[PDB]
């Protein structure tokens, strides 16, 4: 199904402030890819968002209850699986 190097899906856009929901079932620790150990979304790490043929890159800026949207906290105050990603650049053809 979902290929390796999978983290989540975009659920909110505010121009240059993306919010991502982690779709990993559990064990947010050492998702092995290509025999090398990378960690699930962390403050200093990058992410990649492929759009058809070009890949948008971004950097995580906030993790936890801060990245949760406005009224999602109102609906439930105990759910925190969001990250806030800020776009940086893109890779062309």
């Amino acid at each position: 199904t979902e290929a390796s190097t999978y983290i989540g899906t975009v659920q909110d856009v505010n121009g240059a402030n993306i919010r991502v929901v982690l779709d990993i079932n559990t064990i947010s620790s050492l998702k092995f890819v290509d025999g090398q150990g990378y960690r699930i979304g962390q403050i200093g790490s990058f992410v990649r968002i492929p759009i058809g043929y070009i890949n948008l890159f971004g950097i995580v800026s906030q993790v936890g209850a801060g990245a949760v949207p406005d009224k999602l906290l109102e609906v439930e105050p105990y759910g925190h699986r969001w990250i806030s990603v800020q776009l940086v650049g893109e890779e062309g053809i």
């Binding site: 199904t1 759009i51 058809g52 043929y53 053809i93």
Partner: protein, 344 residues
């Protein structure tokens, strides 16, 4: 007035990468031509087949001139239709003034020659058909990919078997493989299972006795239902209905490669489907100059959701334009390589 190749290539790459939207294909006579085992291609084109029939066989050549009076240069389909019409009339031998049974002998001879010429195996695992088969298995799509073919060989079937690709061509059975028609319309097929329809028939079709029940299996000597439509009073009708019904699906996409749009019924069905469903899209891919396809350009001018790709010309959205030759995707092998790269 000027179009960019890279934009269309990116659009196609984004389109094929989708999973839920239904996809289909059309494989015409121009696809096997792009694959060659000997110096010549493993299977000749329609013109090659007509030339081979003409020079392989004054009474015989009368029929070719007789049909040319009311029609352009006759092809295999026209000749076969004329032979079928001649056999329909009992005492039809007076037109050719050659007995009343030589027509059957000629039909048997040409059928045997066609079966001998077409019953070829595709060599090597690097054929584009294997690449397409691998691409189908790559993405587990929500809706399976259908395939329509107008050829006579069994290259697609063999390629599908080689890479373990399940499919269903409307025939169920091990020995006789009778035609099941209720399960086609019931359409509760396995999600992973694909479908393959041969619009013009193949060598595995044989007609039974007065029961007239159609079945598929090992080809027999002196028997081949390779007739395009022939006549009746039928699988062809339900296959056309299946194509039309698929074309009405939401956001459906149909891709044509190697097809010259010479037929009339197929063009009419495509036009009706395009007019009925405003969301369908068709990618007309050619490997020549667009000036050769009068019907295709007429339909592209009439319809707005039709896209044409030629060597040096393209019509997009009722607006004919020029490229920024180009569009190397017209060749079948390049399309297979593009599909393989997309899957990988």
């Amino acid at each position: 007035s000027y179009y960019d190749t890279t934009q269309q290539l990116s659009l196609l790459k984004h389109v094929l990468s989708e999973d839920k939207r239904p996809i289909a294909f059309i494989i015409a006579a121009g696809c096997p031509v792009s694959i060659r085992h000997n110096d010549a291609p493993l299977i000749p084109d329609v013109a090659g087949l007509t030339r081979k029939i003409s020079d392989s066989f004054s009474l015989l050549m009368k029929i070719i001139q007789n049909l040319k009076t009311t029609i352009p240069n006759p092809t295999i389909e026209d000749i076969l239709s004329y032979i079928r019409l001649l056999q329909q009339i009992p005492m039809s031998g007076k037109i050719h003034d050659v007995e009343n049974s030589v027509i059957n002998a000629l039909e048997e001879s040409i059928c045997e020659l066609i079966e001998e010429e077409v019953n070829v195996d595709l060599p090597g695992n690097a054929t584009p058909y294997h690449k397409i088969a691998a691409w189908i298995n790559s993405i587990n799509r929500e809706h399976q990919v259908e395939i329509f073919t107008t050829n006579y060989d069994l290259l697609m079937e063999q390629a599908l078997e080689e890479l373990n690709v399940p499919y269903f061509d409307g025939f169920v059975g091990s020995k006789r493989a009778f035609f099941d028609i209720r399960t086609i319309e019931e359409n509760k097929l396995p999600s992973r299972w694909s479908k393959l329809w041969k619009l013009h028939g193949s060598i595995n079709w044989q007609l039974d006795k007065q029961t007239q029940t159609i079945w598929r299996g090992t080809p027999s000597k002196g028997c081949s239902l390779i007739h395009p439509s022939h006549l009746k009073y039928m699988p062809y009708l339900v296959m056309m209905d299946q194509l039309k019904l698929f074309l009405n699906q939401p956001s459906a996409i149909l891709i044509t490669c190697g097809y010259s749009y010479k037929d009339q019924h197929i063009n009419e069905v495509l036009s009706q489907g395009l007019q009925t469903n405003p969301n369908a899209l068709i990618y007309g891919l050619q490997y020549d100059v667009l000036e050769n396809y009068q019907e295709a350009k007429d339909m592209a001018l009439k319809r707005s959701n039709l896209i044409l790709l030629a060597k040096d010309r393209a019509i997009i959205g009722k607006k004919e334009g020029e490229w920024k030759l180009f569009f190397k995707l017209g060749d079948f092998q390049h399309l297979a390589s593009f599909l393989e790269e997309i899957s990988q």
